[PDB]
Amino acid sequence: TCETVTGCTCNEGKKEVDCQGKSLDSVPSGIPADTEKLDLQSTGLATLSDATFRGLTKLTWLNLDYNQLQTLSAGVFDDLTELGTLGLANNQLASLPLGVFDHLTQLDKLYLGGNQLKSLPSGVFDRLTKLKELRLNTNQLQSIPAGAFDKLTNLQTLSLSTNQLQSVPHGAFDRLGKLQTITLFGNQFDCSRCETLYLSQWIRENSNKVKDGTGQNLHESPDGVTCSDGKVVRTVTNETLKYEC
Amino acid sequence: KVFGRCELAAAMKRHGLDNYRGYSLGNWVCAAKFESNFNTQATNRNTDGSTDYGILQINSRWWCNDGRTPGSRNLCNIPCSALLSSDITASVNCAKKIVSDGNGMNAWVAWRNRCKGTDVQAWIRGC
């Protein structure tokens, strides 16, 4: 029972504020300025702005899953320099602002699954050099920008399943030396395109990474990623595309 | 187990999903395809510390008990481990409770994203 945040529950010891499942008309004003964990999942939040989290500089965990957010402001996360986990899954996000995550240099997990993203801004992840987990699955992504993932040298899990990808740019995964798990199924890879060749060779070379989920102890599914014409992607070689390429 | 498309359609039909709550067989096949890639053992962890399990990605917040999820309700009365089996009976039985809970198949986010409102019967054609 929160003394200072009406109708939310608290653990002042653990610096936790839990408002999950409370109908919110705005983010409450009485949140302790030393709060570390803030749960706002399923509160019905419809907008955020540059000032919404202002002053919550100790936050390390913020959960905005299952709200009604359609856009974010460029500065909404500005103050939150110690954030380690950001939950933005299962909102209605149609786009991300340029620089939206740039202050989150300690971010460890970023959940953007289950939105309506069609594209990613130029360099949106570049500041996130400690990111271990990125979920972009179940969106509407039409492409990935060249070098989108290049700064993500600590990344272990990248989820890209259920999107609208027809290819990935050449060397898209080059810098991901710590990758363990990637999801690629449910896209529409156009295996007539020369860009396929980078992707098929990658999957042959990294076949133990290609999985049907993000959890531990799941056996690889390198043949579960299929071209829009039904062919398994990893079977497509330079020789397969000798005519086209 | 990774099911083939027609193999799963056959299994879901055997277990009574065709037209369950108004949802044709194609809805259930398509849902499995985009939720789990037909993989009975796929899991995905969520921000609130719950986990989505198995071929239909049933969550440990409301539906199954995984012993590590805060405020769990276990409405299917089943360890989540039972939803990782190669036999789909338990996930089907629990899916029947989910689709009965008021919002139909809207619970399934990848279904809602990729299958809802499409020609889902394509997922059982050729079988």
From Swiss-Prot, chain B:
Catalysed reactions, semicolon-separated: Hydrolysis of (1->4)-beta-linkages between N-acetylmuramic acid and N-acetyl-D-glucosamine residues in a peptidoglycan and between N-acetyl-D-glucosamine residues in chitodextrins
Disulfide bonds: C6-C127, C30-C115, C64-C80, C76-C94
GO BP of this protein: cell wall macromolecule catabolic process; defense response to bacterium; defense response to Gram-negative bacterium; defense response to Gram-positive bacterium; killing of cells of another organism
Keywords linked to the UniProt accession: Allergen, Antimicrobial, Bacteriolytic enzyme, Disulfide bond, Glycosidase, Hydrolase, Secreted, Signal
Localization: Secreted
CDD domains, A to Z: LYZ_C
Keyword Cell membrane: no
EC number: 3.2.1.17
Chief location of this protein within or outside the cell: secreted
Domain C-type lysozyme per the UniProt entry, residue ranges: 1-127
Enzyme type, top EC level: hydrolase
InterPro entries associated with the record: Glyco_hydro_22 (IPR001916), Glyco_hydro_22_CS (IPR019799), Glyco_hydro_22_lys (IPR000974), Lysozyme-like_dom_sf (IPR023346)
Residues the record marks as active site: E35, D52
Known tissue expression: In the egg white and polymorphonuclear leukocytes.
Superkingdom of origin: Eukaryota
Assembly and interaction partners: Monomer.
Family note: Belongs to the glycosyl hydrolase 22 family.
Functional description taken from the UniProt entry: Lysozymes have primarily a bacteriolytic function; those in tissues and body fluids are associated with the monocyte-macrophage system and enhance the activity of immunoagents. Has bacteriolytic activity against M.luteus.
Further details from the record: Lysozyme C is capable of both hydrolysis and transglycosylation; it also shows a slight esterase activity. It acts rapidly on both peptide-substituted and unsubstituted peptidoglycan, and slowly on chitin oligosaccharides.
Designated name of the protein: Lysozyme C
Organism name: Gallus gallus
